[PDB]
């Protein structure tokens, strides 16, 4: 059985915004679904009237907080599933990811001695690009639940535009629960840090992290001692992010803000912040041009073929007003390359006078296939890229601004290594990702401890 | 085609002992239930048993605390929103407008009551209604709300479709998502909300009547600021979600067990913060009351003009067996010509039980008539009068007039007669948009709040 | 014996460059100075150069900030207390009563002005006064305040005693100690202070006249609390100390250099937060104005009916050479029959300089007469009228009526005629306790605040 | 020359309070000044009308905060000059002592993981007892500035009742400045802890304290990172205390509170809290009986001849209502005796069901005369008594509640040892105390670091 929505049957956009949005979407767009234009149209028309996932005042606030990051006064933690699935979009799963993020953020806040902006990969991370249209089984590749189905059969892999509305319903339900959890005792600092004390007790390398975990606990107790109750603390904010990949979905979720900011602007209200991937960041393509029309903070992924000149051109197109925190440059080069490739990019971009956020994505540049047949990543390479990234920035005198990690609160066996010493054979036990291998809950927390030590050095 | 798209549907169950209790309670007869097949209902319940909840238990505990304060005479309850939410009107401007209307009332009422106002919206789930007549005036089976069937006057639309349970959830969670965002925003800023109230005074035909009180409120707000209170100092702005718990297939699917981190796990309906049981489904030995008994949420019961003092006491004993102030709200809808006579003996007998309920006034439901022009309508003056009569009752007994429960919208509709705009029978035809009962429009609802604030100040 | 006990008296000096500046300024002639021997004055100054300060520079910087807000039209200045403090009345009940009176006024004024009130007491140093007549009506040399000589009508007491400089300091620091404690206490709690205002309304003969405004204030306070503001949320309650800077031996001894932890060291008079220069000592080329020029404290100048617009501008140029809003307060005491005529040309000319002074009304000083029963007195109605005229002046020019400067006490004295109590010439004899000018008693001062709050609300 | 005050020429006390106050003062009183009764009377009559040094609402609040201490939920730091002098009652000196106390309190708060109640020996510590009426020079002994003069000549040593009013004027001026300093940037946590960072840089043992000082700094930064500004912190409270020694002064400074607490009570408004010394704690003497009539929190000094039974009797007389924090038992036994003498006292008092504060006074039991002729104390004995005191409590399972130390913000050379290795010969350079040797500013801060480590163990 299925549920059924009606196709609906405001004053138009300001003329200039229609023009610019049309011109952006007329450009070539890579990695798009291949479904009929008429059926896409119907689904976009449904989504043009739904309640938004986010609102403009939140995005404006995020932009403020990210400006602090870019100025060297805060740090950005971005993390969650590689690919959300409708099947796994449950309260236990969402809570776990929200918890894992909060757990990391408190460790990171302590180590950085500055605020941590928390951005989950959630409430929309339902689309992925692929280098191959045919996968290793000879099936049309799975592109995420917004496009087709994970099941390895041909009928499941057909692109289905009704997945756009299912995506939005899943996203909005998830966001609802994220808001509720963050305004609960879940986000209480003292609760979150007791979880961190259980980790130390039960990890095989818990002795290695005991001292920092105790220093944190002592820091929290000091706050309380000085007369700071929970009510004194601004409540926890977890923002929603995903890759802006499916332009039918992003364009349908655009909303025109008020002239309470001065000029009406387009905001993508599918999320607070979105990024553009390595396979869709064609400089004259639709995704970059779309990013130029929306008011949200944005990010661009930068891999090992990046040049300093092209990085500058992203800066100049996407932060044309010199607004710190509008743009995030995310670097994945792998651990064996970050120390050699990143510095020339950083130096050229810093010379422009613009202030981007420099964020490390350790995971994407460090993936291999195990002998047992699983797409995996070694924990030690993930840690080493972040280490290299910090070394780049320290030598320069620039700000290592944040990390972008794939994680879950589940005890998955997806990435090799960590204190639990996950082996190739262990991978088979709980390899649950619909896409890339995630740090499990313990490995994500171990990473935060390790990165906190980088911040303290 | 016919302008539809289908969306396909694809965790540990609740504990055995809890299920055994629930199964015993739900064996009771349930009035007004949809007539869809059991097997299809089961499949939809199973979907909904694993979805993210609309609300979470800590919010409901908090609401229970705030309602205890109401029941003790230290806070006032404002409950309002659409009579019937529809899927097609479940949009950003509409939701924003109803949230704004509620907040606009609440500030006027907070000022008049000199005490906090607990704000509960009829929203994010008010998608089912009872029908007295199985055949409507067009010869169709009756519209029962969007969770059951379609408003459109055609037989295919009116068939009871169990897939609407999921559509309802998706709508409710989306709406709640936006309510949370809005409340977290500048929308709930006191100063912003009260500027809207200043525009109302300047433009209303009876603005001169409300000017003095509106000025007194503005001077109050400006005094706060003068004393060195910024918005950041103010309590976070909370709008709770409520609806009539009617469709037991939905409500039972949305039950969850709280975690063990406070006292002990309790059973909550996480489709809303609070629910009520309506006049047509409040059979003492029926399934609706038995459901209300087993959940931990705060609950309400509508009490109309056939109520007896003895039956009201039996609600109190079934639904507040542990004597928890604020757990039970008794919602009086006598009508304006009967409230002064019927309510006191009910109040006296319940008060003698030792229990502390919240006494809430529903002015609207007892005061509905059909206009000569053919529209279901209510007179503004009879609404205002039932609230006046309710206050007189409580005044006289020394009990607390605890709140109001109204049907309102932020839209400039023409559904209720009267008010400062002097909506006539003829005006009704212009913007009669409700899928069910006539609502106070945005101006009427604000005027009601000013008039009730004067009742609170007497 | 004769009922006295003697108390025996037993650090790096200020920087040379600063001293050279000060020595040049103080070479100027100083009117109204005590006539005690130089050598004994020097010894007493030397004691006072090492004592703990009455105030500290961070408080004065903060006051300067708050006064800038007044000068910009965003806050209102309330300055009040005894005409002349005496050592013998420098007691806990008296100080408490004056602090209470000031706080009672300030809440009424804050509500009426819809903006913060900066509270400055005439206290902890108002121990010196000018005398026109070197011989008083009893044939004695005039009482000049307790810092100089004794009130008692006998020749030994009236001799100028330089030891009174130390007595004054000891009294001022003790009083300030208690003002700080009181302000840190429940005394400055809004809710406590405004309950006192409710008792005034119930017991005053004109209480019916003020009832409505008093109720509106109470509803304002209760709204704050309803919105979830507790006392702990409120700004800390600040009462600043002021007096007329008259005795330059005291003022110069109490100068200190701020430390280097903000901008650069500045020279402050730490005998008070703010001082003013009176009508008899404001010679443009005299030592009082030159002293005011060199200190960093906010300062005031009294402007009486001989003032010219040109002389007022010369005060502005000498005393606010850096164009710092709030640094200079111009305190008008025209009298009620002259303020509407004399003040506007002064205001227009000063406003044309580009500088932002605070315009403050001293109703009391221009409105003093001798009763037929032989008491120096003032009529309540002429006091209220000068403030009314001051507001009319500023209204008309679009300038800000910035504050009032009144003489008041928390005691139930009989010094000023009129008010709701209808104090008569005959009543004056009952409790005429001032060592100098007649003060508003506690009821009169509160009534004035209600009347001025109505001026602010028009 | 001298300044001159007038002898003044409320409804009487409730009858029962007059009775009890008369009965208390009729008891024998040790260590009183010998000045004529008539002249004393005149001075008491002046002091009965002066503005009080403290007010009852402050004392009630202190009693709340001390109840937290007694329950094991806060710690008490009490410190300042051994004897204040009129000559040294200056802004530079007061500020220094207030700073030194604040500096210690932040270190202690961090180490204790709980609030620190800060009580200065100030604004009245002008009277001292003496074992001998004739000192080593053959002069009538100096008893503090409230009684006679420090100068070593016979005329200066005569007891002068006018010193009562001079004392009060000095006390009130000092209290005024203490209030002003604590509501200033002086008491800002971040300012206070930068001073602690200079100490670490310039101390000879700074390397030993670097790690804790950095952990504190990181704790402070974490607070700021989590969104706690100064405005969020309740402002710093420093309470005033002294030995209640001169009964002419204490009785004259009594004030009757309101019936806003229910029953009118007598409060000694010369201070917030006072203590009774080893030489005046006669169980049936006037000082203990006076302590029983006033509502202030009080303390009793307990030296090495104390017994468990007599400790209990102080408890039962002075905390007859079982009000936690009303009574503080202060132990000085010396470092070589505390571990053996204190436990039996603690065990018997804990068995009563009453909750006193257990406070260590390291200095008084550990004084000796140097070969160079200076009354002095070794830093290492001071530290060791506190160590012993903590060991007593830990074995018991009771709460080491606080310390009572003699300190100054001046760089004095009065106590031997510390990281600066003050020698007998160094003593001569800046031996400025009018009475017992104080920890100087560095030694007081080193002590706080050391006691913080005891708290953390
Ligand atoms: N209200 C529309 C769109 C919608 C679908 C699902 C969730 C939220 C909105 C419908 O039900 O058809
Ligand atoms: N995740 C489930 C259930 C669901 C429906 C709609 C909104 C949220 C969740 C699905 O996509 O069918
Ligand atoms: N006011 C009294 C007592 C007093 C003395 C010193 C300081 C404070 C009060 C006097 O001057 O004689
Ligand atoms: N300490 C000095 C000055 C002083 C006088 C009075 C009060 C305060 C300080 C003295 O006793 O003479
Ligand atoms: Mn991935
Ligand atoms: Mn209805
Ligand atoms: Mn005067
Ligand atoms: Mn000592």
Residue-wise burial string across C298-327, b where 16 or more C-beta atoms lie within 10 A, e elsewhere = bbbbbbbbebeeebbbebbebbbeeebbbb
Among the listed residues A278, A265, A431, A426, the one whose alpha carbon sits nearest the alpha carbon of residue A365: A278
Nearest CB neighbour to C9, from listed D1, D50, D176: D1
Among protein residues, the one whose CA lies closest to atom 2 of ligand 4: D86
D6·C176 Cβ contact <8 A: no
Residue D383 phi/psi, 5-degree rounding, is: -60, -40
Among protein residues, the one whose CA lies closest to atom 1 of ligand 1: B87
Residues 6+ apart with CB under 8 A from D385: D332, D333, D334, D335, D338, D360, D362, D365, D366
Nearest CB neighbour to D227, from listed A113, A219, A234: A234
Annotated binding site of B for phosphoenolpyruvate: 122, 279-280, 302, 333
Pocket residues: Cβ below 6 A from ligand 2: A 86, 89, 166, 169-170, 173; B 9-10, 47, 51, 166, 170
Q: How far is the CA of D250 from the centre of ligand 3 (A)?
A: 17
Pocket residues: Cβ below 6 A from ligand 3: C 87, 90, 167, 170-171, 174; D 5-6, 46, 50, 169
Q: Is A118 annotated as a binding residue?
A: no
C174·D172 Cβ contact <8 A: yes
Strands (E) located in C86-178? 117-122
Query: From the CA of D340, how many Å to the nearest CA of chain C?
Result: 44
Q: Is the dihedral of CA D14, D16, D19, D21 positive or negative?
A: negative
Query: From the CA of B336, how many Å to the nearest CA of chain A?
Result: 38
Secondary structure string (H, E, C) spanning chain B: CCCEEEEECCCCCCCHHHHHHHHHHCCCCCCCCCCCCHHHHHHHHHHHHCCCCCCCHHHHHHHHHHHHHHHCCCCEEEEEECCCCCCCCCCHHHHHHHHHHHHHHHHHHHHHHCCCEEEEEECCCCCCCCCCCCECCCCCECCCCCCCCCCCCCHHHHCCCCCHHHHHHHHHHHHHHHHHHHHCCHHHCHHHHHHHHHHHHHHCCCHHHHHHHHHHHHHHHHHHHHCCCCHHHCCCCCEEEEEECCCHHHHHHCEEECCCCCCCCCEEECCCCEEEECCCCCCCCCHHHHHHHHCCCCEEEEECCCCCHHHHHHHHHHHCCCCCCCCEEEEECCCCCCHHHHHHHHHHHHHHCCCCCEEEECCCHHHEEECCCCCEEEEHHHHHHHHHHHHHHHHHHCCCCCEEEEEECCCCCCCCEECCCCECCCHHHCCCCCCCCCCECHHHHHHHHHHHHHHHHC
**No. of helices (H) and no. of strands (E), chain A:** 13, 13
Task: Name the residue range of residue C138's domain.
Answer: 52-183+238-458
Q: Is the dihedral of CA C72, C73, C76, C82 positive or negative?
A: positive
CB B298 within 8 A of CB B60: yes
Which residue out of C7, C125, C257 would a mutagenesis test of the D interface target, given it has the greatest number of D Cβ atoms within 10 Å?
Answer: C7
State whether the beta carbon of D364 lies less than 6 angstroms from ligand 4: no
Residue-wise burial string across A415-433, b where 16 or more C-beta atoms lie within 10 A, e elsewhere = bbbbbbebeeeebeeebbb
Query: From the CA of C391, how many Å to the nearest CA of chain B?
Result: 20
Q: Report d(CA A437, CA C109) in Å as an integer.
A: 66
Q: Report d(CA A269, CA A258) in Å as an integer.
A: 14
Touch between chain D and chain B: 3 or more Cβ pairs under 8 Å: no
Q: CA angle at residue A202 from A196 to A208, to 5 degrees?
A: 75
Task: Specify if D208 maps to a domain.
Answer: no
**DSSP classification of residue C271:** T
Among protein residues, the one whose CA lies closest to atom 3 of ligand 4: C51
Alpha carbon separation from C6 to B63, C146, C153, D154, D362 (Å, rounded): 68, 16, 21, 21, 40
D1·C162 Cβ contact <8 A: yes
- Residues 191-210 in D contacting C (C-alpha not used; CB under 8 Å): none
Query: From the CA of A33, how many Å to the nearest CA of chain D?
Result: 43
**Token pair for residue A33?**
């679904």
Residue C226 DSSP SS3 = helix
Q: Report d(CA D41, CA D44) in Å as an integer.
A: 5
**Token pair for residue B188?**
């709930």
- Residues 127-186 in D contacting C (C-alpha not used; CB under 8 Å): 162, 165-166, 169, 172-177, 179-181, 183-185
**β-strand pairing of A266-268 with A254-256:** antiparallel
Secondary structure string (H, E, C) spanning A294-315: ECCCEEEEECCCCCHHHHHHHH
Q: Is C229 an 8 Å CB contact of chain B?
A: yes
Count of CB pairs separated by less than 8 Å, A with B: 136
Task: Specify if D317 maps to a domain.
Answer: yes
**Token pair for residue B204?**
């209303």
Task: Specify if D32 maps to a domain.
Answer: no
Q: Is A231 an 8 Å CB contact of chain D?
A: no
Element containing residue D406 per DSSP (H, E): strand D402-406
Among protein residues, the one whose CA lies closest to atom 12 of ligand 3: D5
Nearest CB neighbour to A2, from listed B6, B59, B173: B6
Nearest CB neighbour to C10, from listed D4, D87, D255: D87
**DSSP classification of residue C244:** E
Q: Give residues whose Cβ lies within 5 Å of ion ligand 7.
A: C 83, 437
Annotated binding site of B for Mn(2+): 83, 365, 407, 437
- Neighbouring chains to B with at least 3 Cβ pairs closer than 8 Å: A, C
Q: Report d(CA D243, CA D125) in Å as an integer.
A: 7
**DSSP classification of residue D185:** G
Task: Specify if A232 maps to a domain.
Answer: no
Task: Specify if C28 maps to a domain.
Answer: no
Count of CB pairs separated by less than 8 Å, C with D: 136
Chain D neighbors of C5, CB-CB under 8 A = 4-5, 7, 42-43, 46, 162, 165
Task: Specify if B341 maps to a domain.
Answer: yes
Nearest CB neighbour to A94, from listed B43, B52, B170: B52
Rounded (10°) angle between helices A206-225 and A441-456? 70
B40·A1 Cβ contact <8 A: yes
Q: Is D211 an 8 Å CB contact of chain A?
A: no
Q: Solving technique for this entry? A: X-ray
Which among A50, A51, A176 is the best mutation to test ligand 1's pocket, defined by most ligand atoms within 8 Å of the CB?
A50
Q: Is A222 an 8 Å CB contact of chain D?
A: yes
Q: Is C62 an 8 Å CB contact of chain B?
A: no
Which among C6, C92, C94, C167 is the best mutation to test ligand 3's pocket, defined by most ligand atoms within 8 Å of the CB?
C167
Q: Is the dihedral of CA C109, C111, C116, C121 positive or negative?
A: positive
For A260, name the nearest residue in chain B, comparing CA atoms only.
B186
Residue C221 DSSP SS3 = helix
Q: CA angle at residue A305 from A303 to A306, to 5 degrees?
A: 70
Task: Specify if C447 maps to a domain.
Answer: yes
Among the listed residues B146, B148, B13, B161, the one whose alpha carbon sits nearest the alpha carbon of residue B89: B146
**Cβ neighbours, 10 Å, residue C451:** 20
Alpha carbon separation from B41 to A90, B53, B85, B166 (Å, rounded): 21, 19, 22, 10
Q: Report d(CA A79, CA A100) in Å as an integer.
A: 9
CB B95 within 8 A of CB A219: no
Q: Is C212 an 8 Å CB contact of chain B?
A: no
Q: Is C211 annotated as a binding residue?
A: no
**Cβ neighbours, 10 Å, residue C241:** 26
C52·D181 Cβ contact <8 A: no
Resolution of this PDB entry, in A?
Answer: 2.0
Task: Specify if D112 maps to a domain.
Answer: yes
Atom of ligand 1 nearest to the CA of A49: 3
How many Cα atoms are found within 13 Å in the side-chain-facing hemisphere of D21? 22
Residue D256 DSSP SS3 = strand
- Residues 362-381 in B contacting A (C-alpha not used; CB under 8 Å): none
Q: How many domains are there within chain D?
A: 1
């Amino acid at each position: 059985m299925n549920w059924t929505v009606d196709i609906p049957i405001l004053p138009p956009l300001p003329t200039d915004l229609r023009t610019r949005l049309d011109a952006a979407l007329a450009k070539p767009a890579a990695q798009q679904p291949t479904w009929p234009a008429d059926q896409a149209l119907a689904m976009r028309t449904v989504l043009e009237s739904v309640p938004p996932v986010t609102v403009p005042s939140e995005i404006v606030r995020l932009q403020e907080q990210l400006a602090q990051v870019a100025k060297g006064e805060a740090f950005l933690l971005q993390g969650g599933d590689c690919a959300e699935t409708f099947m796994d979009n449950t309260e236990p799963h969402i809570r776990g990811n929200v918890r894992a993020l909060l757990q990391m953020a408190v460790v990171l806040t302590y180590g950085a001695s500055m605020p941590v902006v928390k951005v989950a990969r959630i409430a929309g991370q339902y689309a992925k690009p692929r280098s191959a249209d045919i996968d290793a089984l000879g099936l049309r590749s799975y592109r995420g639940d917004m496009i087709n189905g994970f099941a390895p059969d041909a009928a499941a892999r057909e692109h289905d535009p009704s997945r756009l509305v299912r995506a939005y319903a899943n996203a909005s339900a998830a966001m609802n629960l994220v808001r509720a959890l963050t305004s609960s005792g879940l986000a209480s600092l003292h609760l979150v840090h007791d979880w961190n004390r259980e980790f130390v007790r039960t990890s095989p390398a818990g002795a290695r992290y005991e001292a920092l975990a105790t220093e944190i606990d002592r820091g929290l107790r000091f706050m309380s001692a000085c007369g700071v109750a929970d009510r004194n603390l601004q409540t926890a904010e977890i923002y929603a992010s995903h890759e802006a990949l499916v332009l039918d979905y992003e364009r349908a979720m655009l909303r025109l803000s008020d002239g309470d900011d001065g000029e009406p602007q387009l905001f993508d209200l599918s999320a607070h912040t979105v990024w553009i991937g390595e396979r869709t960041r064609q400089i004259d393509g639709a995704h970059i041009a779309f990013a130029q029309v929306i008011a949200n903070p944005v990010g661009v992924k930068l891999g090992p073929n990046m040049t300093p000149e092209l990085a500058v051109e992203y800066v100049e197109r996407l932060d044309p007003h010199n607004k710190p925190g509008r743009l995030t440059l995310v670097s994945r080069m792998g651990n064996h390359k970050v120390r050699d490739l990143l510095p020339p990019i950083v130096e050229k971009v810093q010379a422009t006078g613009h202030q981007v956020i420099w964020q490390c994505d350790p995971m994407h540049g460090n993936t291999h296939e195990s002998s047992t047949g699983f797409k995996t990543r070694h924990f030690d390479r993930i840690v080493d890229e972040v280490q290299g990234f910090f070394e780049v920035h320290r030598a320069l005198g620039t700000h290592p601004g944040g990390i972008h990690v794939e994680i879950t609160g589940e005890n998955v066996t997806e990435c090799l290594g960590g204190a639990q010493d996950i082996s190739e054979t262990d991978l088979a036990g709980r390899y649950e990702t619909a896409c890339d291998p995630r740090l499990n809950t313990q490995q994500s927390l171990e990473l935060a401890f390790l990165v906190a030590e980088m911040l303290r050095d």
